[PDB]
Amino acid sequence: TNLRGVMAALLTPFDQQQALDKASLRRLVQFNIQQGIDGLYVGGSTGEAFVQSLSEREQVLEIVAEEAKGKIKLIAHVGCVSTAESQQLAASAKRYGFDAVSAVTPFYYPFSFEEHCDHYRAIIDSADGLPMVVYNIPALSGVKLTLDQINTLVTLPGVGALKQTSGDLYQMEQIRREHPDLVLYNGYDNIFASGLLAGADGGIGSTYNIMGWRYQGIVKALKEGDIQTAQKLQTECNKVIDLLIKTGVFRGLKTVLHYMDVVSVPLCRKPFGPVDEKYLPELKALAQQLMQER
Amino acid sequence: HHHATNLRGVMAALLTPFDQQQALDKASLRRLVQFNIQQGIDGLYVGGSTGEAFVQSLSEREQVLEIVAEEAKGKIKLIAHVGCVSTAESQQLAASAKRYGFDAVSAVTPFYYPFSFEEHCDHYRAIIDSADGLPMVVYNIPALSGVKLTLDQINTLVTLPGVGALKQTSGDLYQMEQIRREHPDLVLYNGYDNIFASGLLAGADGGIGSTYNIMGWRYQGIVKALKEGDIQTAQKLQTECNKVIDLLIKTGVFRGLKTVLHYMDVVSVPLCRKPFGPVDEKYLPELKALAQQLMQE
Amino acid sequence: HHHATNLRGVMAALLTPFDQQQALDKASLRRLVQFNIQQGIDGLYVGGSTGEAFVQSLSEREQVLEIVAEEAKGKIKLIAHVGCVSTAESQQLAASAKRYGFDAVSAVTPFYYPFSFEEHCDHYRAIIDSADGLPMVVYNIPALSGVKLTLDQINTLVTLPGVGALKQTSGDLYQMEQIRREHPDLVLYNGYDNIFASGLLAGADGGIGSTYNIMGWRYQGIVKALKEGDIQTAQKLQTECNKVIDLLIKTGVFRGLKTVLHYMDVVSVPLCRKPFGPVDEKYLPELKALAQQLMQERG
Amino acid sequence: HATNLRGVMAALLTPFDQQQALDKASLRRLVQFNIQQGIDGLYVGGSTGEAFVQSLSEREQVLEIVAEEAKGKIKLIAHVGCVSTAESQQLAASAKRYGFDAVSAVTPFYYPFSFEEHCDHYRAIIDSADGLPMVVYNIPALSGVKLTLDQINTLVTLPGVGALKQTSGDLYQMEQIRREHPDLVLYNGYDNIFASGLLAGADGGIGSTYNIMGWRYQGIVKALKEGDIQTAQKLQTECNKVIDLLIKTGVFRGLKTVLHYMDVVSVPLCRKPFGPVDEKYLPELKALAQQLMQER
Ligand SMILES: [Cl-]
Ligand SMILES: [Cl-]
Ligand SMILES: [Cl-]
Ligand SMILES: [Cl-]
């Protein structure tokens, strides 16, 4: 119930030699707090966790909890393929003072659903009271959950939310219908208004980094019966999303954060390549415009 | 596309009644048309996927169009789905739909063979030509037709001279918004019934659906609620529609709908055409019960 | 399977010639049945996807079948593809196939609508009853049908009474082995012409193909070469098969095959039925150059 | 220059103990069991080796031991792939340090990178290999990448690349790659189509199931060479009787459980989240083991 809301998928700022840029991480953490964000989702896919070591991920959970613990909600994405490695991160989450833990369906190899459940159970054990945020992610990983299976995942003792990273809003409504109390995060930014309409009660997203007030603006708008306002705001979010998909989403976002003075050097880690120099005009212009809106 | 304004709304994908010898049941087709009209439906999409077009002849599909037009022309809006894999067979139907006085035509993207997009484009231009003044509704339905469109291609498609409308049989609500942003005036039908409210909010301004045959007023209710900023009524109606869709998925959709309409005394014989099988007997009390829920409501 | 042994072989999937009015070209059709029997081909697979069945009416399809029965009956094996979405339509074509003296019938898995496995099986059973003794070739093409059967579903399918062959248009040569393991006397046609050599080794005991029309003797050469334990020539014949398929893919497979026959002066008009478009102007040189190529090595 | 890498390369399993720790005794044992089956070389730290539930140090430790047990005696290829370029670069440098003959890397996964980004990945690793040939992947089914033919041609021609691991069941494309690159070291990666894949143009393979019946695959390689098509098909069928079971049981564990009953690996476990093999299949697996021992 306290995990309900709009939660930024925190990006990982890197210095010129691809190491963790501490000062930029803190500025980005604070930049997000200033936006009226309800929380931070730290070390997810978005934070480039799958190109960081366990110690590099752990250094972030630390530096972020130090910056923002108590001021806004904090969810530690601890997911790895290896259960054991995930269990270490869950244990470090419980130390640093996070409010919750999360884990992507373990990927790369074919694991049965029953292996998934035992994977989450072991991380719930190592989490030590922290609620778990489960994934329904039939895309990036490559698995295909049904609906009885989803009911089993979300009612595993110790599970307190679902990150529904799917554009299937029939499935969303079904979830909400079965679990009226469930904390239920809309995972895809470019359908957020429709996802809340179908059953979600918040979201986790990467683009919240640069326009989080617009998502909070949509929440308010639908809450107040202002449907034209919700649509107009979502259309503004998608205008930004069209661009970012063209430029590469994480690097496009870091670059917009560079023109906003928050992130010193906009780089993603290799094998991600640079933002194509031809998109710099549009991106600085977007930063300008988003700076004009506050 | 602002000249196609009067095609806006909730259109039932009319089923085609068959008798126990698998022949057209014309008495029940007329009953079904009229029942759809009593329900306050905005119009009818005739001979679609839903109306089992692909297991009927051109002559059979033509007989259906004529009987619907006879019953309902001038009363509610009428859309003839004339699409075949063949462009010429398609044209034969677009001409007849004109002859019967239909308000518009439609065509599924021709399927099975791997047609290039500009071949798709020539297929359609030719049907609009044969349609002799009637506006056209184009498609996606990748799920059944196996045709995957890019954004650029969908723009060209809906901006071809004579296109009044897009049936968007796609659950991708990001693309719905992108279509709406680029085309504020376009008529944009939500194809998937189980996301209707969400599709409207993403930018659709109506829908075509198979379940509107049995609870069209609920879908109409959702349109009104969203216009009047009433999300709680919208969500409620969508949940009740999805409770039924849930059931219809278990039973087989077309034949579940036909059985509910049989228990509603509209459709004499609830069969779909082979190779479709009959409703599993175990499901009939649920469907009867449902018919009795819906009729009382 | 036992009774279908006589349908083991290399069978050209016949194309359907059309004139300038999009109507059927009857003399070119007969020009092709003849051109095919002089390649040493074991038979003809008639009215299939390749014969453009799905943009013709029932009437048009029967007409094609009746003609082919005039020209071939007895000489080369004759398989009629009678498959439609509708079971009742498929049955009409099946009965007609029996009337005209075909050796076999076949139907693609019914498509567009998601039908159940049980619904597929009843579809075949009805069609077979209407063929009235003519064995059935179950036709399996996932890429275009959208119908995706399990192995168990395929084993049940190929053992329905009256089924004597599987047409396997799949590149999954694991499954091609598995079906042979389970059914050692099934007539098993390789359906992707570009893997014929590999498919034979995995377990196809023959094939059905669009490209056999123009170069069917090469596939007999593979069967022969593998028979002779001659890996070299078989690989050679397949690379040569694939060189043509490469271009046939670029141009458009059906119309390319038709055009090649148009420069072989077998087809008057190399067009396909709309929505199929004409070929790009720029490929005519290669198609014309290829038609010349194949006659030289043949006759 | 390429041809020395040509042949039948087992994708080596990584044995673990009851605590998931690397089992070095069982790895030594398994490396020797491979060599004496008659294998041409070993593919170390691949997907088959549970690379993606190991840390870099664990992967380096495995590579070092195999190179000690096998340097000079058979070809060794070190799979050095990770998502991260820099992590892959460390592993590649380590492989060079340990005396491997080649390195490999799976197309980087999870995030969608571009084909340009994949090639730059391959460049950075190749550089870090400092002279070791690179084995590239064409993988549509386990990584999500959807490479084209012209892209594969660009891949196989990058400076330093000396082989393609064709982990695709598309034998039209196999034929197509061999026709375009008649010298290329081309490994069949889908074990259950090996013979057919050789006929389309592969000149060797890399597979997990070579750990228990590698002699069958060299026996298929031999049978085709002489033009004994019959024995080639008999062997592929026996390989697929095995591959059917392993698919039921779980391929890596299935395979380890058989090596356990061959007294090769002590503890037949995969790392979590892989569970153990179902106890019902243990009768079948023991039998396969006894069978395969008695068969040589
Ligand atoms: Cl994330
Ligand atoms: Cl429809
Ligand atoms: Cl065919
Ligand atoms: Cl591997």
Numbering used by the authors:
A (entry chain B): 3 to 296
B (entry chain D): -1 to 295
C (entry chain A): -1 to 297
D (entry chain C): 1 to 296
Which lines from the publication concern this structure?
N-Acetylneuraminic acid lyase (NAL; EC 4.1.3.3, otherwise known as N-acetylneuraminic acid aldolase or sialic acid aldolase) catalyzes the reversible aldol condensation of N-acetylmannosamine (ManNAc) with pyruvate to yield the most abundant sialic acid N-acetylneuraminic acid (Neu5Ac). Sialic acids are essential components of complex carbohydrates that play pivotal roles as recognition signals in a variety of biological processes. The residue responsible for this alteration of specificity at position 192 lies at one end of the active-site cleft opposite the active-site catalytic residue Lys165, which forms a Schiff base with the substrate as part of the catalytic cycle. In order to probe the mechanism by which alteration of the residue at position 192 affects substrate specificity, we have undertaken an analysis of the activity of all 20 variants of NAL at position 192 along with an X-ray structural analysis of the E192N enzyme in the absence and in the presence of a competitive inhibitor, (2R,3R)-2,3,4-trihydroxy-N,N-dipropylbutanamide (THB).
